[PDB]
Ligand SMILES: CC(=O)c1ccc(S(=O)(=O)NC(=O)NC2CCCCC2)cc1
């Protein structure tokens with residue numbers, strides 16, 4: 679099936695998933711100087727107090743921390759969003775080296791990695807139905823650079839030896855994702871897509887300006903992960919990112935001057 683190699687990589691995806699060359703594909707380059715401050719943007723409300731992690735999954739693409747999205751416990755609202763969006767999962771995309779890994783770029787700049795806190799609109803009832811809708815998902819994009827450790831990322835780093843290969847999963851309760859947030863909620867926003875197949879055009883994107891600092895050792899653990907399944911030739915999970923896509927008929931709004 680699809681992957682990130684020479685033969686199944688992003689440039690091959692359009693064959694099985696035509697929308698890949700569609701009209702609102704993610705990620706994009708964020709031209710910070712082309713983006714308009716939008717006064718009419720309401721403030722971003724990130725309400726992660728009752729957030730309930732359950733499991734961590736290696737799906738052979740990335741790893742997902744899954745949350746109990748059976749009630750309004752950890753929600754994204756305000757900003758550009760109309761209604762309430764439930765956190766289902768977060769995952770990263772990262773590089774073979776520190777000079778790459780991010781999917782979104784800022785004035786063509788690539789970060790070491792990028793966090794997707796994935797939420798779905800509660801008016802659609804569930805995630806599968808939400809991705810069928812243009813306003814179905816809100817993804818909170820956060821850039822990772824290498825420097826200081828993120829203390830609140832270490833619990834996730836420590837358990838990754840337990841989910842080394844495709845398919846493997848671990849109980850992962852009580853993780854507080856507020857420890858992955860930067861200081862500032864300043865953000866760009868655009869209409870966009872899932873960045874992997876099926877690349878559905880169901881995403882309101884919210885990328886924070888302020889990156890979080892992770893340690894080289896924290897990112898080195900992500901790179902020790904495996905695309906392949908247990909008992910298979912070792913392919914290291916690195917450069918699991920989609921390059922920037924054509925902006926087409928889209929304006930990127932900013933929450934700040
Ligand atoms: C753009 C973006 O953030 C996003 C892309 C795909 C999906 S999905 O297809 O609904 N999720 C998964 O089942 N897999 C996950 C995701 C892709 C890597 C981590 C693993 C969810 C969010």
Ligand SMILES: [Zn+2]
Pocket residue numbers: 769770771794873
């Ligand atoms: Zn993602």
